[PDB]
Design a protein around this ligand. Structure first.
Ligand SMILES: *[C@@H]1O[C@H](CO)[C@@H](O[C@@H]2O[C@H](CO)[C@@H](O)[C@H](O)[C@H]2NC(C)=O)[C@H](O)[C@H]1NC(C)=O
Ligand SMILES: *[C@@H]1O[C@H](CO)[C@@H](O)[C@H](O)[C@H]1NC(C)=O
Ligand SMILES: *[C@@H]1O[C@H](CO)[C@@H](O)[C@H](O)[C@H]1NC(C)=O
Ligand SMILES: *[C@@H]1O[C@H](CO)[C@@H](O)[C@H](O)[C@H]1NC(C)=O
Ligand SMILES: *[C@@H]1O[C@H](CO)[C@@H](O)[C@H](O)[C@H]1NC(C)=O
Ligand SMILES: *[C@@H]1O[C@H](CO)[C@@H](O)[C@H](O)[C@H]1NC(C)=O
Ligand SMILES: *[C@@H]1O[C@H](CO)[C@@H](O)[C@H](O)[C@H]1NC(C)=O
Ligand SMILES: *[C@@H]1O[C@H](CO)[C@@H](O)[C@H](O)[C@H]1NC(C)=O
Ligand SMILES: *[C@@H]1O[C@H](CO)[C@@H](O)[C@H](O)[C@H]1NC(C)=O
Ligand SMILES: *[C@@H]1O[C@H](CO)[C@@H](O)[C@H](O)[C@H]1NC(C)=O
Lengths: 272, 238
């Protein structure tokens, strides 16, 4: 009785370049939420335990991929959107919420699958005389769409005037967050980083810290190739994949072949 | 330049996904050039050039093709205003590489490159606030076909190089392959074809032709053969 898997084989890319999460999280200064700093994490190993080493967090709230055990996944691309907002607005970063930040500074997609990490920074981002470096937008003519950065500071139209000059009825579009060390937690600054995850099987990968093992063929094997897992028998394939293809499908649109992350050999998968 | 229209191009099919299939009739809904679509033919002879380069709309996506023997077309400019006020994408080809740069450019009134070496200053006076650079191999008698799609922040370039021994487009099917996926997040509404027209060191210079079509959401059947090469397709909206 060997119809059940008799081996467990993990195959991941041989990448020793750690993802620069420390540098984005430990940046000396963060961008204003109205003009958040959007960076990209790729071609690296996605070890997420460093986040707990970085700081205690106010909220972690992964959406879509709700488990926080992210060390077993490979993403095609990872983006990191960093900004500083006040504590009372942290809840507005969830995909389905509204308010000054969700609507005018950082709208997140409704089907967002990533993680929203919040860190209390009251001792770093609050100056004795007041920290006036950070700005947020409060006035727009329409709601902000997901992941767009509205940078312009052009004075916001008011009443029925051409609106030239400020004061009588026109407003500067940004208000600023005058942070004080003596404010309560609701008004303290928080550094928020949104990690946007693209889970699209694995045409490209940013894999967590998994240790690859040797391939086993002609046996019933529990396999994990990049972000794709399953049970089956691996055999040498005679299929001609194009240089850009990583997988294959049967006539019923289920996986029947993979490209090995280390050798690029094409293997067919037969269910046990 | 001067634009004729063409109604008979049965071209522009590309692999819609990154998954191998063979001996499969696959139904998919994606942005494709419709069959028998209205495709504009640009024909310029180079005193400097037949007429100063036009700027074309991007719409949903662009099908670009040329059968050029002089190798003058070596890049494209994509963006909104195509001036210093916004960020834009510059894709250029040269004898050794393909240079893709995303920056806030101030392209000069005359977009076309001067080839005499090559001088970057003939395309733009200056650029700043650069965020992306990438280098690929040259994209190179032969008909060169490209599809430029701007979807969910990614600028996806597909291409194929098909030999031609006659004057007319070959009557047959050839699918385009993915070339490069650029994670830019760029808003593209307008683009221009960049012509690397050299000074003949009022002067006579080589001609350049190209065809431009637009993609539309359509449902297609794609016939995948034994090798996973698409050999035929049916436009279900026709
Ligand atoms: C926005 O993120 C980018 C990362 O893509 C930051 O650029 C890095 O800044 C650090 C600062 O110490 C440098 O050491 C890195 O070499 C930079 N890398 C790149 C690719 O630029 C940028 O500084 C961030 N900006 C803000 C305002 O936080
Ligand atoms: C961040 O950088 C500073 C620079 O001196 C370093 O001391 C600190 O340990 C780093 N990590 C954290 C979590 O602050
Ligand atoms: C590392 O991965 C590359 C991917 O193509 C592979 O060619 C190379 O052989 C791997 N390294 C070793 C030591 O096998
Ligand atoms: C139709 O296609 C042929 C090539 O098969 C081409 O020569 C001809 O010019 C096309 N029709 C028009 C409207 O020019
Ligand atoms: C195609 O579109 C152009 C304008 O872009 C127009 O001049 C031309 O007549 C159109 N051709 C047909 C057949 O509709
Ligand atoms: C092509 O462009 C790249 C981009 O920097 C450059 O490094 C290379 O030298 C260029 N080649 C020629 C022949 O101009
Ligand atoms: C670059 O962007 C910053 C954003 O504040 C702007 O102030 C600066 O003038 C820009 N520089 C350019 C486009 O050269
Ligand atoms: C892209 O540009 C068009 C034309 O200027 C504009 O209508 C649209 O809102 C822009 N979108 C973004 C996300 O910048
Ligand atoms: C300029 O290009 C023409 C063809 O377009 C060619 O015949 C001529 O020799 C070229 N001159 C130089 C100096 O490259
Ligand atoms: C696909 O299989 C062979 C393998 O190289 C290829 O040359 C030919 O074009 C195709 N053959 C058949 C029978 O489809």
């Amino acid at each position: 009785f060997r119809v059940q898997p008799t081996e467990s084989i993990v195959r991941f890319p041989n990448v020793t370049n750690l993802c620069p999460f420390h540098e984005v999280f430990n940046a000396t200064r963060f961008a204003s939420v109205y003009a958040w700093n959007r960076t990209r994490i790729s071609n690296c190993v996605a070890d997420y335990s460093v986040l707990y080493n970085f700081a205690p967090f106010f909220a972690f709230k992964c959406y879509g991929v709700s488990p926080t055990k992210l060390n077993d996944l490979c993403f095609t691309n990872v983006y990191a959107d960093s900004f500083v907002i006040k504590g009372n607005e942290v809840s507005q970063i969830a995909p389905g919420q509204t308010g000054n930040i969700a609507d005018y500074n950082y709208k997140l997609p409704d089907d967002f699958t990533g993680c929203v990490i919040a860190w209390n920074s009251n001792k770093l981002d609050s100056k004795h005389s007041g920290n006036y470096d950070y700005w947020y937008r409060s006035l727009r003519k329409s709601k902000l769409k997901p992941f767009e950065r509205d940078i312009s500071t052009e004075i916001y139209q008011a009443g029925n005037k051409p609106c030239k000059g400020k004061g009588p009825n026109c407003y500067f579009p940004l208000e600023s967050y005058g942070f004080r060390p003596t404010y309560g937690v609701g008004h303290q600054p928080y550094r928020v980083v949104v990690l946007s995850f693209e889970l699209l099987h694995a045409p490209a990968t940013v894999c967590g810290p998994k240790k690859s093992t040797n391939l086993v063929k002609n046996k019933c094997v529990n396999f994990n190739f990049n972000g794709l897992t399953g049970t089956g028998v691996l055999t040498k394939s005679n299929k001609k994949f194009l240089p850009f293809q990583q997988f294959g499908r049967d006539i019923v649109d289920t996986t029947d072949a993979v490209r090995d992350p280390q050798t690029l050999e094409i293997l067919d998968i037969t269910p046990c | 330049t001067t634009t004729q229209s063409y109604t008979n191009f049965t071209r522009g099919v590309y692999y819609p996904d990154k998954v191998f299939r063979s001996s499969v009739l696959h139904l998919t809904q994606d942005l494709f050039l419709p069959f028998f679509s209205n495709v504009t033919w640009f024909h310029a002879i180079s005193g400097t050039k037949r007429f100063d380069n036009p700027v074309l709309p991007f719409n949903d996506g662009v099908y670009f093709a040329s059968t050029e023997k002089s190798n003058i077309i070596r890049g494209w400019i994509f963006g909104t205003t195509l001036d210093s006020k916004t960020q834009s994408l510059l894709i250029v080809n040269n004898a050794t590489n393909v240079f893709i740069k995303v920056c806030e450019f101030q392209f000069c009134n005359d977009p076309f490159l001067d080839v005499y070496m090559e001088s970057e200053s003939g395309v733009y006076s200056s650029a700043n606030n650069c965020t992306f650079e990438y280098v690929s191999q040259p994209f190179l008698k032969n008909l060169r076909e490209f599809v430029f799609k701007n979807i969910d922040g990614y600028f996806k370039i597909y291409s194929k190089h098909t030999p031609i021994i006659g004057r007319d487009f070959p009557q047959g099917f050839s699918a385009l392959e993915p070339l490069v996926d650029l994670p830019i997040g760029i808003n593209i509404t307008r683009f221009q074809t960049l012509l690397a027209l050299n000074r003949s060191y009022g002067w006579t210079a080589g001609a350049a032709d190209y065809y431009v079509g637009y993609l539309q959401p359509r449902t297609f059947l794609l016939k995948y053969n034994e090798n996973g090469t698409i050999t035929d397709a049916v436009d279900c909206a026709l």
